Scaffold this active site. Structure first.
Site, PDB file in Angstrom:
ATOM      1  N   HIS A 123     -32.110 -28.175  -0.699  1.00  0.00           N
ATOM      2  CA  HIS A 123     -32.256 -29.431   0.043  1.00  0.00           C
ATOM      3  C   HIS A 123     -30.974 -30.227   0.268  1.00  0.00           C
ATOM      4  O   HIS A 123     -30.983 -31.210   1.010  1.00  0.00           O
ATOM      5  CB  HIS A 123     -33.368 -30.318  -0.503  1.00  0.00           C
ATOM      6  CG  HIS A 123     -33.142 -31.014  -1.825  1.00  0.00           C
ATOM      7  ND1 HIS A 123     -33.745 -30.591  -3.023  1.00  0.00           N
ATOM      8  CD2 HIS A 123     -32.357 -32.140  -2.111  1.00  0.00           C
ATOM      9  CE1 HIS A 123     -33.321 -31.430  -3.932  1.00  0.00           C
ATOM     10  NE2 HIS A 123     -32.514 -32.355  -3.474  1.00  0.00           N
ATOM     11  N   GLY A 176     -29.010 -38.544  -7.060  1.00  0.00           N
ATOM     12  CA  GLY A 176     -27.717 -37.904  -7.261  1.00  0.00           C
ATOM     13  C   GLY A 176     -27.711 -36.893  -8.387  1.00  0.00           C
ATOM     14  O   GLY A 176     -26.738 -36.155  -8.550  1.00  0.00           O
ATOM     15  N   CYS A 231     -29.695 -34.274  -8.812  1.00  0.00           N
ATOM     16  CA  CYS A 231     -30.011 -32.924  -8.360  1.00  0.00           C
ATOM     17  C   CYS A 231     -28.913 -31.916  -8.588  1.00  0.00           C
ATOM     18  O   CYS A 231     -27.733 -32.216  -8.379  1.00  0.00           O
ATOM     19  CB  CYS A 231     -30.421 -32.913  -6.903  1.00  0.00           C
ATOM     20  SG  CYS A 231     -32.063 -33.634  -6.769  1.00  0.00           S
TER      21      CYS A 231
HETATM   22  C1  LIG Z   1     -31.713 -35.196  -5.930  1.00  0.00           C
HETATM   23  O1  LIG Z   1     -30.597 -35.884  -6.459  1.00  0.00           O
HETATM   24  C2  LIG Z   1     -32.970 -36.086  -5.981  1.00  0.00           C
HETATM   25  C3  LIG Z   1     -33.333 -36.521  -7.427  1.00  0.00           C
HETATM   26  C4  LIG Z   1     -34.554 -37.449  -7.547  1.00  0.00           C
HETATM   27  C5  LIG Z   1     -34.431 -38.854  -6.855  1.00  0.00           C
HETATM   28  C6  LIG Z   1     -34.756 -39.982  -7.897  1.00  0.00           C
HETATM   29  N1  LIG Z   1     -34.896 -39.197  -9.088  1.00  0.00           N
HETATM   30  C7  LIG Z   1     -34.801 -37.903  -8.961  1.00  0.00           C
HETATM   31  O2  LIG Z   1     -34.902 -37.110  -9.889  1.00  0.00           O
HETATM   32  N2  LIG Z   1     -34.087 -35.362  -5.360  1.00  0.00           N
HETATM   33  C8  LIG Z   1     -34.768 -35.844  -4.312  1.00  0.00           C
HETATM   34  O3  LIG Z   1     -34.461 -36.893  -3.747  1.00  0.00           O
HETATM   35  C9  LIG Z   1     -36.021 -35.074  -3.847  1.00  0.00           C
HETATM   36  C10 LIG Z   1     -35.784 -34.400  -2.491  1.00  0.00           C
HETATM   37  C11 LIG Z   1     -36.677 -35.056  -1.487  1.00  0.00           C
HETATM   38  C12 LIG Z   1     -37.520 -36.109  -2.200  1.00  0.00           C
HETATM   39  N3  LIG Z   1     -37.121 -36.037  -3.614  1.00  0.00           N
HETATM   40  C13 LIG Z   1     -37.647 -36.753  -4.631  1.00  0.00           C
HETATM   41  O4  LIG Z   1     -37.370 -36.527  -5.808  1.00  0.00           O
HETATM   42  C14 LIG Z   1     -38.588 -37.856  -4.225  1.00  0.00           C
HETATM   43  C15 LIG Z   1     -40.001 -37.503  -3.788  1.00  0.00           C
HETATM   44  C16 LIG Z   1     -40.728 -38.369  -2.933  1.00  0.00           C
HETATM   45  C17 LIG Z   1     -42.047 -38.059  -2.562  1.00  0.00           C
HETATM   46  C18 LIG Z   1     -42.657 -36.890  -3.036  1.00  0.00           C
HETATM   47  C19 LIG Z   1     -41.946 -36.013  -3.871  1.00  0.00           C
HETATM   48  C20 LIG Z   1     -40.624 -36.316  -4.248  1.00  0.00           C
HETATM   49  C21 LIG Z   1     -37.861 -39.118  -3.761  1.00  0.00           C
HETATM   50  C22 LIG Z   1     -38.501 -39.090  -5.119  1.00  0.00           C
HETATM   51  C23 LIG Z   1     -36.834 -33.573  -1.770  1.00  0.00           C
HETATM   52  C24 LIG Z   1     -38.055 -33.046  -2.512  1.00  0.00           C
HETATM   53  C25 LIG Z   1     -36.382 -32.565  -0.731  1.00  0.00           C
END
Ligand SMILES: *[C@H](O)[C@H](C[C@@H]1CCNC1=O)NC(=O)[C@@H]1[C@@H]2[C@H](CN1C(=O)C1(c3ccccc3)CC1)C2(C)C
Ligand SMILES: *[C@H](O)[C@H](C[C@@H]1CCNC1=O)NC(=O)[C@@H]1[C@@H]2[C@H](CN1C(=O)C1(c3ccccc3)CC1)C2(C)C
Lengths: 305, 306
Positions: free
Chosen positions: A41, A143, A145
């Protein structure tokens, strides 16, 4: 004596963490040999995350769309590919600090250390467990991830987790290092829910053994149980079935303390039925489930890495 | 989101850990530049251990009585001196893995990460606090002496603790890196016990703020308190006095959540009166006291989940 939630020493993994940038999107990667691994992603814009076509998205990138940074140094990307939900970026430089490593997939109930990183920089280390529902109860901001989870075995880093997402309930989901999710989750920003969690019974018994090893003994009754009668009570409290394999695994701790597994099960039965009654075990007013049998043995013997 | 007891990444300290042997006794040392620091009780016999005269024991040693091992490498000891309760062995080689460092002395309430080592080799890393009674509740077996405690600020390692001893209750005592003990304790096998411990009140308040930032408000109430009526009640549960200095450092968390410190004090008074009632805060059924304000600020989001 003493019993703490203890992580593995993180030094080997700290020298593998890099920053990966693609466009506006920036996260961490793991640099091992001449390959950098990160969540796929990274290739998404915020609008793409709502319904990504990772084939089409990645076909529309090439090597120069990726900036990899190790410290101050930019690593030049020379190839790119996607394995499941992880992107593999090939770099021109092999990491000189690559440890002896394995990619392993862990089971629910097993534990690992997480090295939380932001921008390629390690910020914290913490121990957690793979829950029965395949989530982790972690601590992760935006951040984070690409932060990895690991165990150490005999000098080998066994990498087992890469962080991808937070679910609505505040618990976390990710993949193994080959990109396969733990749990019924997808890397799409759409409504997802983990299922009802359960308590990891073998780990509770292990931690009750750790309590005995450290002198907390008030919960030990003179009652006993069969494994069947134990599981019949435990199932009513959302505890996982204790198998004979779990009993065998608790063997060493049973031999070390002198307390039979089923007598510890009868102790646990009464803690579930009656409560703690205001008392604590190892500093907690609830039953802890994120120490495996092997974590107890390791910490109560001084094993080094 | 989420909230974890979190240690600092340990790699900078791992590259400073050595084994120190003197006679039959073996413990860990910390190798910074061309000095290895360790507990001085590495020089003791099993007989003198009630009443060691360390000056007298140490003058009877040469440099070559100290075997220092850094991995495979023997470091040659080329000088020795004692500073308080730590021994400083000068070696012929400066450690190339030496970080940016300071030695600091911490207060009760403050937190640090411990890298627990045996034989110069790290076993694990955990976070803990300096308790009001000057002990730490660590995890330390025999051989762990010389394991250090630390914080990392911007790639500088501030070392704050060196482990020396376990007290009868299973709590732990030790020194700063200049060798002065935290607390009244002595590196003798004379009968010692810790004093009655107390809860670190500012840290409980911080962790209640962390719970609000992560989205729980169930324990809040409509009330406020004076600071003095707060302390009059809190002392009856063995909580440390909250000072105005403590109220100041909770400032940022108060501003982020919108909850005044003395209104969070009122919540805490009711939590102590009522208990949890089957509920939890941040995964715990007790009020946790080993997260500082700074730990909460560092680990949490700057957006409250409202
Ligand atoms: C990557 O750094 C990030 C880490 C998350 C954000 C806050 N805490 C964490 O652990 N990952 C993402 O942003 C990830 C990406 C997009 C959404 N997402 C999430 O973790 C969300 C989310 C929202 C709705 C449903 C499921 C997940 C924003 C919190 C994707 C899954 C591609
Ligand atoms: C150093 O490795 C060791 C670590 C202790 C032992 C078990 N857990 C630990 O943290 N330190 C010592 O052995 C220390 C040395 C000798 C006694 N001692 C203790 O910790 C004792 C003790 C006994 C009587 C009174 C006070 C302390 C054994 C538990 C000295 C203080 C010099």
């Amino acid at each position: 004596s003493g019993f703490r939630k203890m992580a593995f020493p993180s030094g080997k993994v700290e020298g593998c963490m890099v920053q990966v940038t693609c466009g506006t999107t920036t996260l961490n990667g793991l640099w091992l040999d001449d390959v950098v691994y990160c969540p796929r992603h990274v290739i998404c814009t915020s609008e793409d995350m709502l319904n990504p076509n990772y084939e089409d998205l990645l076909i529309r990138k090439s090597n120069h769309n990726f900036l990899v940074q190790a410290g101050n140094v930019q690593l030049r990307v020379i190839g790119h590919s996607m394995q499941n939900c992880v992107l593999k970026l090939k770099v021109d430089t092999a990491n000189p600090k690559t440890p002896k490593y394995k990619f392993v997939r862990i089971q629910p109930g097993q534990t690992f250390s997480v090295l939380a990183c932001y921008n390629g920089s390690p910020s914290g280390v913490y121990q957690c467990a793979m829950r029965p529902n395949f989530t982790i109860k972690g601590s992760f901001l935006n951040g984070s991830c690409g932060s990895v989870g690991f165990n150490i075995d005999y000098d080998c880093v066994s990498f087992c987790y890469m962080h991808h997402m937070e679910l609505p309930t505040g618990v976390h989901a990710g993949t193994d290092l080959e990109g396969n999710f733990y749990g019924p989750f997808v890397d799409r920003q759409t409504a997802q829910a983990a299922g009802t969690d359960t308590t990891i019974t073998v780990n509770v018994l292990a931690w009750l053994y750790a309590a005995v090893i450290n002198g907390d003994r008030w919960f030990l009754n003179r009652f006993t149980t069969t494994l069947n009668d134990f599981n019949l009570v435990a199932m009513k409290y959302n505890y996982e079935p204790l198998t004979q394999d779990h009993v065998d695994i608790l063997g060493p701790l049973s031999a070390q303390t002198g307390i039979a597994v089923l007598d510890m099960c009868a102790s646990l039965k009464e803690l579930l039925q009656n409560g703690m009654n205001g008392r604590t075990i190892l500093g907690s007013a609830l039953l802890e489930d994120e120490f495996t049998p092997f974590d107890v043995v390791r910490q109560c013997s001084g094993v080094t890495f």
